[PDB]
Design a protein around this ligand. Structure first.
Ligand SMILES: [Br-]
Ligand SMILES: [Br-]
Ligand SMILES: [Br-]
Ligand SMILES: [Br-]
Ligand SMILES: [Br-]
Ligand SMILES: [Br-]
Ligand SMILES: [Br-]
Ligand SMILES: [Br-]
Ligand SMILES: [Br-]
Ligand SMILES: [Br-]
Lengths: 105, 105
C-alpha cells in the first residue's frame, strides 16, 4: 500500500472499540486486561474510540514515538492477539477478521 | 444564540473529558460516579470524549431522544453539578468556569 505513517484498521465486527494510549508503560501493557484499561480512561494519554466496520484511520502524534493499541471486541469476548505496541514513525495496518482474529499487516 | 439543537460546551479547564451515554437508565444516572461510569465505557451507547479548552460541539443523534452527559474534571476532582440528562431535540449549552463550576445556559 501507499499509506504513510499512521494507524489503519479494517474491521469486520460491529461494535468493536479500540483503546489508544500514548507513552504506555510497557510493564502495565503486558499485564493489562479489559478491566485494568477501563480504570485509565480518564487519563490524558488515553482515548477510547469506536471502530466502524470497514476502513478506519486514527491520528497519531509524530512527537509521541510509542503507543499502546488495545482491541476491545464486543460482549466481553477475548481474542488472542488483541494488544500491540506501535510507533507513530511506522505504517500500522490491522485487520479484524470475521472470526474475530486480528492480523497486523 | 443562534445555535440549532445540539451539544455545545465552553471549557476553561484543560484535560477535562465528557462521557456521553445515549438512552441512559435514569436510576443508574442518579447513582453514578466516575468509577461506575468507567465500567460502561465499552458499551455501544457510551463515548468518552476529550474536551478542548475553548468552544466544543459534539454530535447528537436526532433519533435518540435522551442522553446522559457526565463531566469528568481532571485529577479525580469533583464539582457539584457534573451530570445532566439532555435531549437531542434541544439546544444544550454548557460552560465550565475557571473555578471548575459548571453552568447550563
Ligand atoms: Br468514538
Ligand atoms: Br460501515
Ligand atoms: Br473490512
Ligand atoms: Br485467547
Ligand atoms: Br487473534
Ligand atoms: Br477524544
Ligand atoms: Br484550545
Ligand atoms: Br471558553
Ligand atoms: Br461537590
Ligand atoms: Br458545579
Amino acid at each position: 500500500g501507499s499509506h504513510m505513517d499512521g494507524l489503519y484498521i479494517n474491521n469486520n465486527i460491529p461494535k468493536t472499540k479500540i483503546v489508544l494510549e500514548s507513552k504506555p508503560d510497557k510493564n502495565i501493557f503486558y499485564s493489562d486486561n479489559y478491566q485494568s484499561i477501563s480504570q485509565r480512561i480518564y487519563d490524558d494519554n488515553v482515548k477510547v474510540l469506536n471502530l466502524k466496520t470497514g476502513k478506519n484511520e486514527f491520528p497519531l502524534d509524530k512527537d509521541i514515538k510509542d503507543y499502546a493499541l488495545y482491541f476491545i471486541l464486543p460482549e466481553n469476548k477475548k481474542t488472542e492477539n488483541w494488544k500491540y505496541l506501535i510507533s507513530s514513525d511506522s505504517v500500522n495496518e490491522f485487520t479484524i477478521k470475521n472470526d474475530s482474529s486480528i492480523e497486523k499487516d
